[PDB]
Each structure stands twice: as C-alpha cells, then as structure tokens.
Amino acid sequence: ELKPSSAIQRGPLNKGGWDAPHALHNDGAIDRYAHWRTFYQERFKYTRATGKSTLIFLVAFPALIGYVAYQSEGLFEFAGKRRGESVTTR
Amino acid sequence: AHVLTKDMIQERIVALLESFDKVNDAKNITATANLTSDLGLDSLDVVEVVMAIEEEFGLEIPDHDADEIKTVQQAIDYVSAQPAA
Amino acid sequence: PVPFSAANKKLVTSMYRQSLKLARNWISNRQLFRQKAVEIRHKFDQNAQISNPRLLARTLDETRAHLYEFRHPDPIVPPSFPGGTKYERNVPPRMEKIMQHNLYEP
Amino acid sequence: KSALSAVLMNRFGDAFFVLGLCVIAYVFGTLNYSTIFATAYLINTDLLVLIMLALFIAAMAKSAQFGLHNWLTLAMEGPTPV
Amino acid sequence: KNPYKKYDDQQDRRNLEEPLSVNDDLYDMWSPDRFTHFKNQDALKYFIGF
Amino acid sequence: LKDYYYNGRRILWEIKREGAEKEDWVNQMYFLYAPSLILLLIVMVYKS
Numbered sequence: 001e002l003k004p005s006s007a008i009q010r011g012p013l014n015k016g017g018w019d020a021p022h023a024l025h026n027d028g029a030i031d032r033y034a035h036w037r038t039f040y041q042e043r044f045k046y047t048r049a050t051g052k053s054t055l056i057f058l059v060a061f062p063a064l065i066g067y068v069a070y071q072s073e074g075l076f077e078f079a080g081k082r083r084g085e086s087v088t089t090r
Numbered sequence: 091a092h093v094l095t096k097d098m099i100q101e102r103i104v105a106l107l108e109s110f111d112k113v114n115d116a117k118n119i120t121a122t123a124n125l126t127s128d129l130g131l132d133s134l135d136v137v138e139v140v141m142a143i144e145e146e147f148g149l150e151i152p153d154h155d156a157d158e159i160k161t162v163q164q165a166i167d168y169v170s171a172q173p174a175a
Numbered sequence: 176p177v178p179f180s181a182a183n184k185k186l187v188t189s190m191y192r193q194s195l196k197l198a199r200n201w202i203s204n205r206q207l208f209r210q211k212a213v214e215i216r217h218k219f220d221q222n223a224q225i226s227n228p229r230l231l232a233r234t235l236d237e238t239r240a241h242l243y244e245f246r247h248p249d250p251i252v253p254p255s256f257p258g259g260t261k262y263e264r265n266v267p268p269r270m271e272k273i274m275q276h277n278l279y280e281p
Numbered sequence: 282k283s284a285l286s287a288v289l290m291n292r293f294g295d296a297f298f299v300l301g302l303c304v305i306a307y308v309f310g311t312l313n314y315s316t317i318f319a320t321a322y323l324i325n326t327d328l329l330v331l332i333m334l335a336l337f338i339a340a341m342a343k344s345a346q347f348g349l350h351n352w353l354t355l356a357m358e359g360p361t362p363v
Numbered sequence: 364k365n366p367y368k369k370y371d372d373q374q375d376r377r378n379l380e381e382p383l384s385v386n387d388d389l390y391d392m393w394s395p396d397r398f399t400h401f402k403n404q405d406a407l408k409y410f411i412g413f
Numbered sequence: 414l415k416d417y418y419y420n421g422r423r424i425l426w427e428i429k430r431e432g433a434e435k436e437d438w439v440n441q442m443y444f445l446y447a448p449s450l451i452l453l454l455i456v457m458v459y460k461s
C-alpha cells in the first residue's frame with residue numbers, strides 16, 4: 001500500500017554523445033593477463049620467496065644503508081685539500 | 091636493379107638439373123617432371139637437389155615447405171612466390 | 176624406431192638437410208666442403224638399409240647427438256630473411272583509412 | 282633493441298661521470314679547465330684517485346673497453362655511413 | 364619459436380588469442396637476447412677462465 | 414544546431430574541405446595565454 005508516488009515519470013539515463021567506433025580489438029588473453037597483474041595483491045600469499053625478498057628489501061637493505069649513513073656523517077670534507085692532509089675528521 | 095621473370099627461374103632450374111649426375115636423362119626433363127619418379131631420384135637425392143636449389147636462388151626453406159615441392163612446376167611456382175631473388 | 180615409411184622418411188630427410196646446412200658454415204673453401212659433403216653422403220649411404228628398430232633408433236639418436244655436437248654460432252642466413260640483417264627494414268604500411276574517435280575535432 | 286643496449290651502456294658511463302663531476306665541483310669549486318689545471322698539483326691524491334676513477338669509468342664506457350664492450354658490435358644494425 | 368610458421372604478428376611471434384605466461388615480459392620478443400649455444404654455467408666458467 | 418553541425422561534419426557548409434577554421438579555444442589562448450606567457454618571460458629576463 002506504500003509505493004512511490006504517481007507524479008514521478010522517471011526516464012532512462014543516457015551518457016550522451018557520439019558512438020565512437022572500435023579502434024581496438026581487445027585480446028582476451030591480454031585483458032585477463034593485465035587484470036591478473038593489477039589485482040595481484042588480493043591473491044598474494046607469504047612463501048619462502050616472499051619471506052626472502054621481504055627480509056632483504058624491507059629489513060636488511062634499510063639496516064645496511066642505515067649503518068653506512070650514520071657512520072659517515074661528519075667524516076668527509078674534500079673542500080680545500082692538500083697533499084699530506086687527512087680528509088677524514090676522525 | 092635486377093628483377094627475375096618466370097622463364098628465368100625456368101632456365102635456372104633446368105640448367106641446374108642438367109648439371110646433376112644422378113638424373114636419369116638430360117632429355118626427359120620438363121616443367122611437370124616428378125623428381126622422385128621421372129628423374130629416378132632417391133628419398134635423399136631430392137633433398138640434395140632441394141639444398142642446391144635453395145643455395146642457387148639465395149633463399150632459405152623450412153622443412154615443412156621443402157618436402158611439398160615434389161614436381162618441378164611446384165618448385166618453380168614456390169620459388170616465384172617469394173620477393174627475394 | 177620404425178622401418179621404411181613416410182614419417183621416418185621425413186625425419187631422415189630433415190636430418191640430412193640439417194647435416195648439409197650445418198657443414199656449410201663451418202667450411203670456408205668450396206673444394207674441402209664438397210669433398211666433406213660427399214663423405215657425409217657416404218655416411219648416409221652406408222646406412223639406410225637397417226632392418227631392426229633397435230639398432231635403427233640407437234644409430235638414429237647417436238647421430239642426432241653427433242649432429243648436436245657440431246652446432247655453429249651464427250648460421251649463414253640470407254639477409255632479407257628472419258635471421259638476416261635486411262629483415263624488416265621498410266615493411267610497407269598496410270593501407271588504412273583513418274578511424275575517428277571524437278565528434279568534434281580530428 | 283640494439284640502440285637500447287648502446288644508450289644504456291653509455292648511460293652507465295654517464296652516471297659515473299655525473300659522480301665525478303659532482304666531486305669536481307665540490308673539490309675545486311669550479312668546472313673550468315683553466316682553474317682546475319692550475320690547482321691540480323696541490324690537491325690530495327686520494328681525492329684525485331676517486332675523481333679520475335669515476336671519469337675513467339665514464340671514458341671506459343664510451344671508448345668501449347672490456348667492462349661493457351658489447352654495444353659497438355651490437356651497433357651494426359645501424360647502417361654503414363652511420 | 365621458429366620464425367617460419369605463420370603468426371598473426373610476425374614480429375611478436377604470437378597468435379591472436381594465445382595465453383600469456385606467468386611473468387610474460389621475460390619471455391617476450393622485447394625480452395633479453397637469451398643465447399642458446401652454451402649452457403650459462405659453462406659460459407660463466409669459460410669467461411672467468413679467460 | 415551544434416549537433417547538426419558536428420555530426421554532419423563527421424559523416425561528410427558540409428560538402429567542402431578547406432583549411433581556415435577557428436576552434437573555440439584559439440581566441441583566448443593565442444591572444445591572451447601566449448602573450449601573457451611571453452610577458453612572464455620578458456619580465457623574468459629583465460628582472461634578472
């Protein structure tokens with residue numbers, strides 16, 4: 001007994017314009033491939049290879065470049081130099 | 091430049107087969123001659139003449155297209171199919 | 176693996192085309208090459224009368240391995256062909272009218 | 282693919298020349314040949330080894346010594362007068 | 364792949380609807396050159412030997 | 414009228430082919446955007 005009112009007269013929605021003809025034959029294999037590649041993260045799972053790359057690029061490489069960066073803060077000036085002059089501060 | 095014709099391919103292949111020893115005769119040679127039956131060639135002498143014909147026209151043949159040219163007319167049409175001379 | 180037949184014929188013809196072409200790019204001289212090719216031919220003439228399948232397949236894959244040992248770094252290709260250097264220099268563009276995508280400007 | 286190989290070898294050398302050029306402009310404070318050569322004998326040797334090492338890896342890349350030497354003979358896909 | 368079989372694109376060596384592999388762009392025509400005359404471990408030995 | 418002009422220009426005044434034409438944007442990009450950008454160049458060069 002509750003229906004939206006009679007004075008609506010709602011019509012269809014177009015997007016309008018010119019039917020651009022198909023400039024591309026889509027490949028089913030290429031489209032399935034690319035849809036698998038962009039949405040890879042919803043099927044990603046941890047394995048030993050994932051653990052190896054996640055260890056080395058997220059943990060080991062920041063720690064190595066970290067140690068190298070904190071050791072070498074005020075070591076080197078080369079600004080005006082001479083023979084027999086050490087360039088390391090330490 | 092230098093563009094071949096059909097009769098050029100004809101007198102190249104005929105003179106080629108006239109050079110060859112294991113033919114039957116130099117006189118029974120035609121455009122429609124079977125290499126296997128009419129010329130008296132083995133299973134393996136037709137291969138040596140396909141090697142010589144592909145060296146002679148300067149062109150390369152895959153194994154699927156070499157066995158198909160059984161008669162001489164098929165060889166002339168097939169060699170005339172390619173753009174390279 | 177099988178005696179006189181069309182498929183065994185196709186295999187042995189393919190292997191002979193190979194062994195000729197393979198010997199072709201090792202050897203620079205004409206004279207030594209055509210000697211060698213006559214020898215190669217004599218190796219194929221001494222065979223091709225073998226009755227059993229056992230020794231036939233034995234010599235078959237043995238000369239296939241002997242064919243694999245004498246492989247060459249660059250095969251002589253004609254240049255207009257897919258190993259060559261003239262391959263795909265000016266491939267002619269296929270004749271296409273222009274597809275249009277915009278109602279308003281080209 | 283051959284032009285790709287040639288440019289990426291040369292760009293390996295380009296990166297080591299950018300390293301060497303940063304050290305040039307750091308140590309001497311200039312890039313001019315006349316000022317660098319006038320004060321080259323005074324500068325420390327370890328800096329000098331570092332600079333000429335980087336500039337030699339650049340030169341070794343373009344002048345086709347053994348470390349990356351393929352791209353010359355992989356540049357025969359370009360024509361004869363090139 | 365052999366070059367003499369007729370493909371849709373001769374340059375790609377690939378038919379129109381052919382399934383593309385796990386990690387395709389290493390098995391592309393635009394991939395590395397991928398020599399075939401020496402085994403790679405052997406060639407490692409010959410290079411370091413010279 | 415806009416639809417009847419451009420649809421007929423795509424399928425086929427209609428039946429001509431000339432060169433002289435002004436797209437809607439070229440009035441205020443060549444005559445206002447470009448000279449104000451040249452004016453930005455000139456004031457940067459002499460302000461230096």
Ligand SMILES: CCCCCCCCCCCCCCCCCC(=O)OC[C@H](COP(=O)(O)OCCN)OC(=O)CCCCCCCCCCCCCCCCC
Pocket residue numbers: 282283285286287289290293347348349355393394395396397
């Ligand atoms: C005094 C000390 C002397 C030291 C001497 C020893 C130096 C050895 C180091 C050599 C490094 C060479 C530079 C590496 C980048 C070169 C990139 C390149 O050239 O790629 C080529 C490749 C196409 O080549 P290809 O397909 O094989 O053949 C085409 C011919 N038809 O093009 C492509 O396929 C593009 C896609 C691949 C691009 C490469 C992606 C990975 C890049 C890794 C760079 C590593 C840099 C650090 C190297 C550390 C070496 C220790």
